[PDB]
Amino acid sequence: SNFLIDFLMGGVSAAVAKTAASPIERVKLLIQNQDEMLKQGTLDRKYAGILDCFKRTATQEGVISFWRGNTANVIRYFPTQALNFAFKDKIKAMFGFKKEEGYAKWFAGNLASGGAAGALSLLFVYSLDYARTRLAADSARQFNGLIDVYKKTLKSDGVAGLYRGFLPSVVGIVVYRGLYFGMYDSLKLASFLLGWVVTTGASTCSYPLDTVRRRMMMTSGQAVKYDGAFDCLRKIVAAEGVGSLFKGCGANILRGVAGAGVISMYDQLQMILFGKKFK
């Protein structure tokens, strides 16, 4: 039952990190998809910034509201790690490389590997991300829970509603991984600084894809939908300008530092309270 303990405790760790990150995560998602909310009459007025969003959301909805949708984040660990344990090792065997065999080969193989594993994961898991996203962007709240989101979205758009924005998310995974490993190699506390700068750059450069993905998610249950990722992109840029793609980026970076800090702290607390850390 050792594997069970490692599994569940790892899930507790991930749950801690995601729960801590949750409040600033929602602010990012609100600022990012506020035009969609305006379209769906879920928002009364465009936000002025991060502080505005925090203040308004708090005073109007409450404090607990900041952890809305986080349950999806918590229960996401188990199917992902089940898939992670099952196939990630075997997939790496198919595409992986030691740097000595070739840097180009290592890079490309790493891209293909991470992309394929990520896609395989999303094939089972993407719906949870959809639910999280739809629950984050609210306020009579449009949705009343995970199950409500699923049932209603299935009732309106069927299965495709749950998997909307899949391709820009995959492309996003590939791009993000490429930037991450590239920057990681280029420049290699010191560890905290490196991790923060790398993560920040990689996530920032790959952000518009994420925005497209999430706003495509938002169109589920609506009469008007984007005709693919490129169509979405084109319409967003035409209507609101290029900067609109980067809406909520800074809040996401704040989620970054927050998450890194919390996960390091909790790792320390794990070494204190338990013999070994479960990550």
Ligand SMILES: C=C1[C@@H]2CC[C@H]3[C@]4(C)C[C@H](O[C@@H]5O[C@H](CO)[C@@H](OS(=O)(=O)O)[C@H](OS(=O)(=O)O)[C@H]5OC(=O)CC(C)C)CC(C(=O)O)(C(=O)O)[C@H]4CC[C@]3(C2)[C@H]1O
């Ligand atoms: C278009 C985008 C933007 C760029 C790509 C992704 C991630 C950043 C992509 C990121 O993708 C992660 O990248 C990591 C660094 O390479 C990689 O770690 S590593 O392989 O050990 O090196 C993770 O692989 S895993 O096996 O450990 O789990 C991988 O997560 C996945 O592939 C699982 C999928 C279910 C996502 C995961 C994730 C994260 O913020 O971390 C997450 O799902 O939480 C995404 C957020 C959403 C976007 C943002 C997606 O909307």
Ligand SMILES: OC[C@H]1O[C@H](O[C@H]2[C@H](O)[C@@H](O)[C@H](OCCCCCC3CCCCC3)O[C@@H]2CO)[C@H](O)[C@@H](O)[C@@H]1O
């Ligand atoms: O806040 C007002 C508007 O913000 C966004 O529009 C941005 C666009 O997204 C954005 O692409 C556009 O850019 C124009 C400014 C160009 C910046 C020049 C850079 C030079 C280098 C240093 C940084 C700035 O500015 C618009 C504002 O006039 C939103 O997309 C709009 O919906 C919103 O009405």
